Amino acid sequence: DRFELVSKYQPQGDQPKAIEKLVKGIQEGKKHQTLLGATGTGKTFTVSNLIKEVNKPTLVIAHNKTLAGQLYSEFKEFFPNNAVEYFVSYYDYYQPEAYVPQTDTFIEKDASINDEIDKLRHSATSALFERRDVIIIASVSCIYGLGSPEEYREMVVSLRTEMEIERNELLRKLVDIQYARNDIDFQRGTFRVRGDVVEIFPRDEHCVRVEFFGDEIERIREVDALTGEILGDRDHVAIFPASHFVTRAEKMEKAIQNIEKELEEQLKVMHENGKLLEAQRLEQRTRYDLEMMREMGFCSGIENYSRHLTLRPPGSTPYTLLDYFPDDFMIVVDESHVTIPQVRGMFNGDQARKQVLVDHGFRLPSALDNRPLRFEEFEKHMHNIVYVSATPGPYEIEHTDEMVEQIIRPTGLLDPLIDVRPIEGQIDDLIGEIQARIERNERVLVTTLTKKMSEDLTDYLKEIGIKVNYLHSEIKTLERIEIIRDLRLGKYDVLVGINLLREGLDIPEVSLVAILDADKEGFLRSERSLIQTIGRAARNAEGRVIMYADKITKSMEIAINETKRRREQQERFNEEHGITPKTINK
Amino acid sequence: DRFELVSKYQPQGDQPKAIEKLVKGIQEGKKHQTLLGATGTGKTFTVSNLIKEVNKPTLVIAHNKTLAGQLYSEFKEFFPNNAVEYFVSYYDYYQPEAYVPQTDTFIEKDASINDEIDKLRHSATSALFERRDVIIIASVSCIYGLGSPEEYREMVVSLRTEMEIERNELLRKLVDIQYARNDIDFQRGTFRVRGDVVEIFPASRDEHCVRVEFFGDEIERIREVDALTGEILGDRDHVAIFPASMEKAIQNIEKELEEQLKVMHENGKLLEAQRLEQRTRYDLEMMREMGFCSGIENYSRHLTLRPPGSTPYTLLDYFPDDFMIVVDESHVTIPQVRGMFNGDQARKQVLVDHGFRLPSALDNRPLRFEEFEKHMHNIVYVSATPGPYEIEHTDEMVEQIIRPTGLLDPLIDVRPIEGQIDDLIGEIQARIERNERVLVTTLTKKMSEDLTDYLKEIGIKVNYLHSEIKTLERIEIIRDLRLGKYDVLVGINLLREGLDIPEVSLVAILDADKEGFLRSERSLIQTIGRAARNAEGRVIMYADKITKSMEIAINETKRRREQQERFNEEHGITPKTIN
DNA sequence: ACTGTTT
DNA sequence: ACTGTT
Numbered sequence A: 001d002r003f004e005l006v007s008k009y010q011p012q013g014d015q016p017k018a019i020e021k022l023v024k025g026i027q028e029g030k031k032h033q034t035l036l037g038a039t040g041t042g043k044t045f046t047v048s049n050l051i052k053e054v055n056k057p058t059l060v061i062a063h064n065k066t067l068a069g070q071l072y073s074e075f076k077e078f079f080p081n082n083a084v085e086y087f088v089s090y091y092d093y094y095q096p097e098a099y100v101p102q103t104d105t106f107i108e109k110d111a112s113i114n115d116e117i118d119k120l121r122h123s124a125t126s127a128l129f130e131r132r133d134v135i136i137i138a139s140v141s142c143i144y145g146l147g148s149p150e151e152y153r154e155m156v157v158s159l160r161t162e163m164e165i166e167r168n169e170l171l172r173k174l175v176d177i178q179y180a181r182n183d184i185d186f187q188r189g190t191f192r193v194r195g196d197v198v199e200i201f202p203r204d205e206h207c208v209r210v211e212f213f214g215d216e217i218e219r220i221r222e223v224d225a226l227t228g229e230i231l232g233d234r235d236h237v238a239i240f241p242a243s244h245f246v247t248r249a250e251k252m253e254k255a256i257q258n259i260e261k262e263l264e265e266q267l268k269v270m271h272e273n274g275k276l277l278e279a280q281r282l283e284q285r286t287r288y289d290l291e292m293m294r295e296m297g298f299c300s301g302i303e304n305y306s307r308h309l310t311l312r313p314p315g316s317t318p319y320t321l322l323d324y325f326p327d328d329f330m331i332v333v334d335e336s337h338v339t340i341p342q343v344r345g346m347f348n349g350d351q352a353r354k355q356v357l358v359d360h361g362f363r364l365p366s367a368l369d370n371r372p373l374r375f376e377e378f379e380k381h382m383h384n385i386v387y388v389s390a391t392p393g394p395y396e397i398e399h400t401d402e403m404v405e406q407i408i409r410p411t412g413l414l415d416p417l418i419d420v421r422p423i424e425g426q427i428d429d430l431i432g433e434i435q436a437r438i439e440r441n442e443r444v445l446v447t448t449l450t451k452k453m454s455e456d457l458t459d460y461l462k463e464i465g466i467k468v469n470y471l472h473s474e475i476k477t478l479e480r481i482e483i484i485r486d487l488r489l490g491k492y493d494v495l496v497g498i499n500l501l502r503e504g505l506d507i508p509e510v511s512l513v514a515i516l517d518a519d520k521e522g523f524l525r526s527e528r529s530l531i532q533t534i535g536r537a538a539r540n541a542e543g544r545v546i547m548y549a550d551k552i553t554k555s556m557e558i559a560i561n562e563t564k565r566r567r568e569q570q571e572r573f574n575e576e577h578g579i580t581p582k583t584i585n586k
Numbered sequence B: 001d002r003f004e005l006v007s008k009y010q011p012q013g014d015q016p017k018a019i020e021k022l023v024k025g026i027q028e029g030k031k032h033q034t035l036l037g038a039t040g041t042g043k044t045f046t047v048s049n050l051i052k053e054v055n056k057p058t059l060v061i062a063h064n065k066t067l068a069g070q071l072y073s074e075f076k077e078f079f080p081n082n083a084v085e086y087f088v089s090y091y092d093y094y095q096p097e098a099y100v101p102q103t104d105t106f107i108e109k110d111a112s113i114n115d116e117i118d119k120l121r122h123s124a125t126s127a128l129f130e131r132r133d134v135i136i137i138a139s140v141s142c143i144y145g146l147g148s149p150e151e152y153r154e155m156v157v158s159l160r161t162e163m164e165i166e167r168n169e170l171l172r173k174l175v176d177i178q179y180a181r182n183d184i185d186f187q188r189g190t191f192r193v194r195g196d197v198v199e200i201f202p203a204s205r206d207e208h209c210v211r212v213e214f215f216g217d218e219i220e221r222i223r224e225v226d227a228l229t230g231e232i233l234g235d236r237d238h239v240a241i242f243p244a245s246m247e248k249a250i251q252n253i254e255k256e257l258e259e260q261l262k263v264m265h266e267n268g269k270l271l272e273a274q275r276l277e278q279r280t281r282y283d284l285e286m287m288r289e290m291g292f293c294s295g296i297e298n299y300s301r302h303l304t305l306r307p308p309g310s311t312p313y314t315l316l317d318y319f320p321d322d323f324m325i326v327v328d329e330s331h332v333t334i335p336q337v338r339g340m341f342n343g344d345q346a347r348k349q350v351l352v353d354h355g356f357r358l359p360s361a362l363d364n365r366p367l368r369f370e371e372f373e374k375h376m377h378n379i380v381y382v383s384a385t386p387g388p389y390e391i392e393h394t395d396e397m398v399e400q401i402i403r404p405t406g407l408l409d410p411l412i413d414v415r416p417i418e419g420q421i422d423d424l425i426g427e428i429q430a431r432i433e434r435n436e437r438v439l440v441t442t443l444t445k446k447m448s449e450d451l452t453d454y455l456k457e458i459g460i461k462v463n464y465l466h467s468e469i470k471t472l473e474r475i476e477i478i479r480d481l482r483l484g485k486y487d488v489l490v491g492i493n494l495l496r497e498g499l500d501i502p503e504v505s506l507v508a509i510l511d512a513d514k515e516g517f518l519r520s521e522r523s524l525i526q527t528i529g530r531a532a533r534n535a536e537g538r539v540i541m542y543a544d545k546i547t548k549s550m551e552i553a554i555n556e557t558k559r560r561r562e563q564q565e566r567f568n569e570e571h572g573i574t575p576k577t578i579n
Numbered sequence C: 001a002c003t004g005t006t007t
Numbered sequence D: 001a002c003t004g005t006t
């Protein structure tokens, strides 16, 4: 069971030295490692080479779904005959249940499930049991609560051809996973028994037809529900529960008894504290949910009662995707300096929101037990970890003994030239630079601190006659795609906005980045943000960065210096190999 | 009030003659009118001119949401100080309830509402009551069932600044909709009552609050509040509260059910009769308790106490008697509109036949085309290739063929099927050298998949377009083709939005004589148009026979290319590909 | 063809 | 900043 890397290309630039150093690290027993990979060096390809050499089930963590999406595409292209999986949240929209004490307002949980993503998540989890050649591209959804791996093996009806099973036990195993029997009104969530045939109906109007020989599964075939076309014949099939939670029916009565025991104890507490309104709200909400459970078996926000339903002790650590991975497994953190604080921050935020709900009698204290992992908990799972970032964070720096630099680009393209200009005459100067780039058919990206500052420059630039677009803080993964497209094609020559660190703004047509108020206090003015902003001008052979500031900040100095370092190393390699860099590549 | 058209540009080419002829038509009492506007002539502005001159509440119908979207943007730019509204379906996902007799399979209705679209629809409907300077860009959703505009006036709490209303009456008007009073647990669907203040937590996802400050019996101020922050999102002058979301109706359904049960039994349809009682009786108990049930829409005719057979209330009823309708791509929209009713009835009839629904379910339906025709006061069909309906109803056509850019309709060369590919290959190879792109149309997916695989073997950067492609995949594919990632596009349907790109200098119609929908007179004219954004735009038709369809297309192009060439002579214009 | 469509 | 979130 080995990873087969399918590429026409071979490692160029400093990818060979990087792979050798990172594979030796894993072999030598090094846990924490960091790849300092500049943008344009082929980070994914280096990683793919490492994944192949080390041959270990891997987990790729991305700080956003857009980035995760691209990585999945990139990895599926390199490993077509291996298990490349995608594990992200199945909610298309998720408004968590919350209380705003600031205004005495209660926000009910409102969410919408994407069934395609749910199918993908199932492909991912079940793949970890089948084979060792697995790569899972995931978001922070990998540190959130999931069922016990043993519980997963039990709650999934897996059927193979020529398998010995009594038609009647199959039915029991199906009812056990929330399916009903309906030979009269056949639909999603139900199964029907025609002859020596069981038809199972689990979105996507598809259904499994199991033909029985006597006590042996004679044949298994997929059918289109809307047409009745025999869509294809199968050898294996895994039926998943009809519900979105579906609790184990047996262990449910003790759980209801345990909640009532916690509720009574919490009421004596709230009363012997004078919190009477909160105590009234708690009884009303809890007692309702318990009656909904006794009747249906489910209730809205049943997840809050999770600790009691699994009969697990208080304080207990949740089961996560990380538990479905073997002891000997690798983790690769993309944009580590972003992901690490994100991962670290999910527990604190979750507890913060849930604590206010507890304090005001909306939920019992056991609600806090249904949570993502503590960073300490996540750390206990790190077997072999590789942090990937162009600007690694403090955590990665403290844990990596030696950095693994990958700064040389295959195209030979260099990191930009930074010129620092005064704030007095900022705009007129920038205007002249923008005007000059239009003449040369090049594009400009400008950053501000305030949205107001940004809108004002857009309105003035539009008055002069410059084709401009202002980037809003909240932009959809289409408005983005369209905006990058139009700037590339030339519908816009300049882009204004706070935050150029959005995906895909690294365009070959951009020859100038202008950082207005470079010396001012702001997140996007930090050493790391500046280095990342500078990188937006590096896809161009004549790439330049202009910093408008009166003072040179420690942040600016570091950024200016790191760029000098890299630009020099690259220029020295271009001398030794006789290369002249050319813009949009090839 | 009047429509104020805000444009920096003035009508060029044949736009002035078009506007004059179309405005005179409305004034002279016409009836039905058609605007034969070629792609690239600025049809929307001609329409905007007409909308301003005639000054009448208007409805724009588009055959797809993408096209509807662009038109809304275009109209919002021209009338910024008027009511430009968007009315399309609020469902992000809709699987209608259906039965598959071929396999005895029942498909439950599964839906998922887009709240932003719902807000937009409400802005549209309520705007029609407030002002006469309204333009509504809509899809076929405008011929589907809606509440009586009268029932709307009653079931919507509309509040204005000075106003004057009893604080207590406002509460009654809120409870009368579906609002509960909760000062203890304030949340979605409830109202509060603080001091001389009423805080209302509306319907969904925005997570906003309406704070009504009352000066004795006057509405002193109405201001929007961020529920998640407590932040005062902005001050308002008008606000419309929508519902949080009968006995005679329940009695009437039971009366229809009993009558339908005697019928079914007498015909021996016992399984269907069991299914009907079970389903109906359940829904009626759900209605007596809650007031709602899943699929309550099916009972709509009984709930409005209207007679059987009755025509539904539509967006068209909210418009004044004196109103205008503008049909974009009429040769596409008209058949669409006309086809709605037939499909709906077909699906609902099978459900009725098998005892899933009562026969009154058919009364909850879109409009009949005959019904829609009875609403036409002043109608303007806009199309580059008008359909038979528009042709039969328009007395005189209003042509707008002259482009401001001077760009001409392509040159069509007809080549034999024998040597089809080698010839096409040579033409594609030649365009790569000149940095131009190619679009190829086949009939079957085999021919399409097969040419892509062979062109990729030769070394041509190609992409095959799937029959099923999402809006993002479309936008991306075109983008990549413009930027040069691919030099050629292969596929069945080239009539997809935005496929007419300035970089494309060649359209190749493989099996041009082979007869299918996309080989019809009209389809060919639209396919030809994909090469008209280029100054050296050429079309190659691979066929052995010249079909009536081909002749018409070839001739209309000759006509339009000649008129344009003659205009370019008289005004001394040299066309340039604008990229 | 392909998109539209169910207070 | 901005995105994550059986």
Ligand SMILES: Nc1ncnc2c1ncn2[C@@H]1O[C@H](COP(=O)(O)OP(=O)(O)O)[C@@H](O)[C@H]1O
Binding pocket: A009, A010, A011, A012, A038, A039, A040, A041, A042, A043, A044, A045, A074, A410
């Ligand atoms: N040695 C190589 N030869 C050719 N292409 C390569 C090589 N290494 C990487 N690539 C490709 O170069 C592209 C650009 O690199 P980059 O923008 O840094 O993306 P990433 O870091 O995600 O791989 C990617 O499509 C990648 O697959």
